[PDB]
Structure 1
Amino acid sequence: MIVLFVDFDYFYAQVEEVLNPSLKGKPVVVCVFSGRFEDSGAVATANYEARKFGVKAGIPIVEAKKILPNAVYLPMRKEVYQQVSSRIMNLLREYSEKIEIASIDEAYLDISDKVRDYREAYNLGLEIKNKILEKEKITVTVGISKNKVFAKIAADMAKPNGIKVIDDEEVKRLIRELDIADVPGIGNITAEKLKKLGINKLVDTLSIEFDKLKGMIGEAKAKYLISLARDEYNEPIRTRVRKSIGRIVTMKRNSRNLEEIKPYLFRAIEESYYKLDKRIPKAIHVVAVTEDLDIVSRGRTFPHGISKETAYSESVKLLQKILEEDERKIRRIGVRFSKFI
């Protein structure tokens, strides 16, 4: 099994670079401005010129501005990046019938039936980087290995504008050396739960009784790491089917006044319905992020498709429910729709 993983480099910012060439070379910081105060908000993606100085996704806009005060700060333009992404994904479709779009900038290709070895597999990923570059002027990084996970890990090592193959040999090496925290799907939370169990490398999962692990991080993540450690991971490339579509927003100020929150909720509904396009959801979920950044939610599943009007009146009921059951003020409010007809 030969998996070829494609990951677009600092995508949001790179697109801005393509639509405005005079930006390349200089630090570009694509941000999400909340409007709670000057430059309130967060960095969503920065290019390499910026990242080399510590300005990257997640940090506060105001912090970025302290480090790189003369960088070009741009507001997020999601729809624009989504259309560019659609065209590039279509380019990838032309190299394999088995494709798995994982996000707006990541796709796995099962080229097991397209190449004989990693040499051909390397040349194909070479052809792809040149195809995308030719038509969209977007650089991407290619990862190649025996399974999706290691294909991705490869791409993370080669970034940016890179390409790398991790053969059966290197896989065994990584299983022993690789900091398990660098394994896709393992965040800070799960990593710490591991150090405390004396597991810092994929291999270390083979030296501890299953239940001890399956009891610390859960059965799924257990069977996941173990399978990777034993070099038995082989999840197939599955054609992605969007299962949910939503929208969440930050309010100018925290609140718990149903009438002050409503405008933000309805806006989220309108945007969600525009993005549902033809898809009829049967389940709605209202999601609130409280003042202390905790996450709270209430949803409902109807035995029929949810019209916009039902969305409006039902979301209000779900928001009221949250307010009654939780006394904290809300900071972000949004809605997610799922279970499509």
Structure 2
Amino acid sequence: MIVLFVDFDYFYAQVEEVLNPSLKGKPVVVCVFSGRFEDSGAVATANYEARKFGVKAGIPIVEAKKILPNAVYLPMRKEVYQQVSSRIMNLLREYSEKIEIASIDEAYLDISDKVRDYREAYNLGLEIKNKILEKEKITVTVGISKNKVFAKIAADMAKPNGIKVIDDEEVKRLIRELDIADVPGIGNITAEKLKKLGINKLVDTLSIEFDKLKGMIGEAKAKYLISLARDEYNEPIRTRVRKSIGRIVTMKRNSRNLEEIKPYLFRAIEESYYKLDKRIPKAIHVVAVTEDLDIVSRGRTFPHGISKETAYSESVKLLQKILEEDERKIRRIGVRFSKFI
């Protein structure tokens, strides 16, 4: 199997730069303003100019402004990024039927039936980068290897605006020299647990007692890491089918007053249904983000599709369940639909 992974460079910010060339060269920060107070919210992403001084995804907008008060701050316009993204994904389908869109700015192409070796794979990669640049003037990074995981690792190493191939030999090398925290799917929580086991490289997972590893990071993650260590990971590239559609919004102020939360909850339901398009969900979850930012969720699965009317009444039941089972104040409220017919 030969896999080619594509990840668009500093996507949200780059799109803004394509739509407004004068931004090129200046630090640009795409922001998610929450409305609670002046500059309240988080950074969605920033271009490399801004990222260079510590302004990156996730940090508070207020903090970004302390670091680069003169950077250009733009409100996130996800709809616009989504449409640009959709066009680029369509350019990708031309290179392979087997494509897995993993997020708004990345996808995997199984080009096994398209090239014969990495040399050709590399060229196809350059071809794809030129194509996207020509059509949308967007730079992306390509990663190529024997499976999805290493194709992604390949791209992470070559970004931004790059291209890299990790041949069979380098895969074996990485299984020994690569920091395990840099393996896709390993976050801070898991990385830390692994360090507490003396595990810092994929190969190390092979010298520990399975159940000990398992008992520490879960059966799935343990098996995942082990299969990679054994150079046995080979998950197929498959069409992604969205499994849930929802909306969660921050309220002007925290509260646990039903009548005061409802409007938001109902707004969330309205937007979610629009997104559902023609999909009919059999499950609904009311999601609350408490004042301390903990997440409390209560849902229900019905034997038949949920009409928007049922969604209204049922969501109110779930919200109250949360209210009676959690005394904290609610900061954000939303709904999430799944199990589509």
Tell whether the structures are fold-level matches, with TM greater than 0.5: yes
Q: Report Cα offsets for 1:153-202 as digits up to 9, x if no partner.
A: 01001110110011111111111111100000000001111111111110
Quote the Cα distance in structure 2 between the aligned partners of 1:29 and 1:317: 40
**How far 1:293 moved relative to its partner?**
1.2
Q: Distance in 2 between matches of 1:169 and 1:327?
A: 56
Identity of aligned residues (%): 100
Q: Using the alignment, how far apart are the partners of 2:264 and 2:8 within structure 1?
A: 32
Q: Which ranges in structure 2 are unaligned for 5 or more consecutive residues?
A: none
Once structures 1 and 2 are overlaid, which stretch shifts more, 320-329 or 242-251? 242-251
1:8-42: CA deviation from partner (whole Å, max 9, x where unpaired):
11111111111111111111100110011110000
> Is 247-256 or 79-88 further displaced after alignment?
247-256
The match for 1:161 is 161
Runs of 4+, deviation exceeding 4 Å: none
Deviation at 1:292, TM superposition (A): 1.1
- Point out the more displaced range, 259-268 or 39-48: 259-268
Q: Which residues of structure 1 form unaligned runs of 5+?
A: none
TM-superposed deviation, 1:252: 1.8
CA separation in 1, counterparts of 2:48 and 2:325? 45
How far is the alpha carbon of 1:289 from its aligned partner? 1.0
Q: Aligned equivalents of 1:286 and 1:209: distance in 2?
A: 40
* Post-superposition offset of 1:294: 0.8
Task: State the alpha-carbon separation in 2 of the partners of residues 313 and 138 from structure 1.
Answer: 45
Match of 1:217 in 2: 217
Of 266-275 and 89-98, more deviation after overlay is shown by: 266-275
Corresponding residue of 1:177? 177
Alignment correspondent of 1:121: 121
Deviations 1:255-295 (A, max 9, x none): 11111111211111111111111111111101111111111
Q: Distance in 2 between matches of 1:182 and 1:84?
A: 29
Deviations 1:296-338 (A, max 9, x none): 1011111111111111111111101100110000111111101
User: Any idea what the Cα deviations from partners look like across 1:76-130, whole Å, max 9, x if unmatched?
Assistant: 1111111111110011001001100011111000001100000000000110001
Q: Output the CA distance in 2 between the equivalents of 1:299 and 1:74.
A: 35
- In structure 2, what is the Cα distance between the partners aligned to 1:266 and 1:19? 34
Larger deviation: 321-330 or 246-255? 246-255
Q: Are 1:295 and 2:295 an aligned pair? A: yes
| Counterpart-to-counterpart distance in 1, 2:262 and 2:126 | 50
For the residues of structure 1 that align with 2:270 and 2:71, how far apart are their CA atoms? 34
> 1 CA distance for matches of 2:304 and 2:138?
42
Q: CA deviation at 1:136?
A: 0.8
Distance 1:34 1:81 in 2: 19
Find the counterpart in structure 2 of residue 281 from structure 1. 281
Structure-1 separation of matches of 2:316 and 2:11: 36
* Partner Cα separation in structure 1 for residue 185 and residue 63 of structure 2: 28
Instruction: Kindly provide the CA deviation profile for residues 50-73 of structure 1, in whole angstroms up to 9, marking residues without a partner as x.
Output: 101100000000100011111111
Q: Give 3-state SS (helix, strand or coil) of 2:333's partner.
A: strand
Instruction: Give secondary structure in 2 for the equivalent of 1:198.
Output: coil
Q: Give the SS at the match of 2:216.
A: coil
> Matched residues in 1 for 2:65 and 2:306: separation?
44
SS at match of 2:217: coil
d(CA) in 2 for partners of 1:159, 1:240: 25
- TM superposition shift of 1:2: 0.5
Q: CA deviation at 1:213?
A: 0.5
Q: What is the CA–CA distance in structure 2 between the aligned matches of 1:247 and 1:116, rounded to whole Å?
A: 44
SS at the partner of 1:80? helix
SS at match of 1:216: helix
Pairs aligned (count): 341
